[PDB]
Amino acid sequence: GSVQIVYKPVDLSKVTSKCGSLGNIHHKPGGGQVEVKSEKLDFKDRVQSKIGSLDNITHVPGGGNKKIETHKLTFR
Amino acid sequence: GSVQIVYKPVDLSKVTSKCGSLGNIHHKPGGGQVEVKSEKLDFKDRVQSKIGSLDNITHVPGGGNKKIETHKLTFR
Amino acid sequence: GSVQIVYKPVDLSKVTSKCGSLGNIHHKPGGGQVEVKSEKLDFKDRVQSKIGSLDNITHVPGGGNKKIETHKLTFR
Amino acid sequence: GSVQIVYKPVDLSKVTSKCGSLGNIHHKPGGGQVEVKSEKLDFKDRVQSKIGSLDNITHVPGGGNKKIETHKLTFR
Amino acid sequence: GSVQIVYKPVDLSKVTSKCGSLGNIHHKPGGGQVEVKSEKLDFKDRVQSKIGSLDNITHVPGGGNKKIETHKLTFR
Amino acid sequence: GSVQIVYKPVDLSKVTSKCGSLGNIHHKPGGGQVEVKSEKLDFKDRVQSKIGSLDNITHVPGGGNKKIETHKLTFR
Amino acid sequence: GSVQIVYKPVDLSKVTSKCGSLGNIHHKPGGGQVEVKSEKLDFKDRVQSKIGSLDNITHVPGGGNKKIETHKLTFR
Amino acid sequence: GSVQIVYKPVDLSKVTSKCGSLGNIHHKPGGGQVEVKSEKLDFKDRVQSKIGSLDNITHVPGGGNKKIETHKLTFR
Amino acid sequence: GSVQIVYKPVDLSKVTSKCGSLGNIHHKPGGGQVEVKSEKLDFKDRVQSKIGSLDNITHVPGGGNKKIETHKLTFR
């Protein structure tokens, strides 16, 4: 039939931050082990994997603001 | 038939933060173990996985504001 | 029939940050082991993998702001 | 006076050990911090000292037997 | 006076060890920070000292037996 | 006076070890970090000292037996 | 004392068979599958193992008679 | 003392068979599959192993008679 | 004392067979597949192993008779 779909989302939004001095941050990790013992790995379709990782992250963004959007229109 | 769909969500919202001095932050982890013993792994469709991970994160964003949106319209 | 799809998402949005002095950040990791013992890997289609990684990240962007969009229009 | 001293301690003793297989010893310390914050130090005569130290000792002597003697004769 | 001193300690002693296979010893320290903060140090006579040290010792002597003697004769 | 001293400390002692295979010894330190801080130091007589050390030792003597003696005679 | 053991068992026995025509023997099994799906095998001390064996045996001895003996004399 | 052992067993036994025509023996197994799927094999001390064997045996001895003996005399 | 051992087992036994015509034996197995799929083999001391064997044995001895003996005399 005479099907009609209008997709018109209007976005005027704002993500903002104000900060003074940002600093004097100390990160001193004391080491330590990670250990993974296994047998054969068998990953198939679309698998996402992380094994035995050791991370030490210092992340000091002045802003660090995030806006995430996902506009979707499926028709069949 | 003569079906009509109007999708017009209007967003005028704001996410905001104000801060003075941001600092004098100390992170001193005392080490320590992570340990995983296993047999064969068999991940199939769309599997998401993490094993035996050790993390030390210092995250000091001056703003750090988050806005997440998911506009969706499915038709058959 | 006379099927019609209009996709006109209007975006006037903004991600912003203001910060003063950004500095005096110290990151001093104490080492430590990562260990992964295994048998054969058998990865097939679309697999994403990380194994046995040791990371030390210092990340100090002046802005570090992110805007992510994913517009999608699928038709059958 | 006409003093006489005979010092004739006779030692016929034995310290002994017999051992079969000695092994399969594991020592896995997880790191971690040790810290000393102070004022002026003023150590004097005959001191034996350890300050803020982190130690890991593995000692597997096949014998490890100890015999200690201290013979003394003071005359005035 | 007509003083006489005989110092004839007789030693026939033995320290002994017998051992089979000696092995499969693992020592895996995980790192870490060590810190000593102070003002000026003023150490004097006969001092033995260790400061802020991070140490790992593996000692596997096949024998490792010790015999210590200290013969002393003072006359006045 | 008519003083006499005889110092005849006979010693027929033995320090001994018999050992099989001596091996498969592993030593894997994970690194680390060290800080010692002070305003300029002052150390005097007969000192043994170590500052800010980061030290690994593997010591596998097939004997490693020790005999120590001292035979002090003082006459006044 | 004068311990004595006499071991003098007399065997005069017979194992016997008489048969006419031995034949018109058919062994016609209808085939068929054997299937074993597994993971890693980890056999240690004294293991005796068979996996997936398929046998078709036709055994037609004209006699097939058996006599088994085990004479034993233990002294302490 | 005067310990004495006499081992003098007499064997006059017989294993015997009489058979007429031995024949018209058919062995026609219909084939068939054997399948073994596995991961890594890890056999250690004294392991005895068979995997996937397929046998077709036709055994038609005219006699096939057996006599087995095991004479033993142990002294301590 | 006067220890004595006499070992004089007398064997006058017989294993015998009589058979007429020996023949008209057919062995026609319908073939068939054998399949072994695996990962790496890791065999150590005293391992006895067989993998994937296919056998077709026809054994038609005119006699096929067996006589087995095992005389043993152990002294300590």
Numbering used by the authors:
A (entry chain G), B (entry chain E), C (entry chain C), D (entry chain F), E (entry chain H), F (entry chain A), ...: 304 to 379
The authors write:
Residues 297–391 (using the numbering of the longest human brain tau isoform) constitute the proteolytically stable core of paired helical filaments (PHFs) from the brains of individuals with Alzheimer’s disease. Here we use time-resolved cryogenic electron microscopy to study the in vitro assembly of recombinant truncated tau (amino acid residues 297–391) into paired helical filaments of Alzheimer’s disease or into filaments of chronic traumatic encephalopathy. At later time points, the first intermediate amyloid disappears and we observe many different intermediate amyloid filaments, with structures that depend on the reaction conditions. At the end of both assembly reactions, most intermediate amyloids disappear and filaments with the same ordered cores as those from human brains remain.
The first reaction was carried out in the presence of magnesium chloride for forming PHFs, whereas the second contained sodium chloride for forming CTE filaments. During the next 3 h, additional types of filament formed. Again, most filaments comprised two protofilaments that packed against each other in various ways. Some filaments with three or four protofilaments also formed, including the previously described triple and quadruple helical filaments. Finally, by 720 min, most filaments had adopted the same ordered core as that of PHFs extracted from the brains of individuals with Alzheimer’s disease, although triple helical filaments remained in some replicates. Other models of secondary nucleation include: maturation of filament types through the sliding of protofilaments relative to each other; growth, association and/or dissociation of protofilaments at the sides of filaments; and formation of new filament types by partial structural templating at the end of, or at defects in, existing protofilaments.
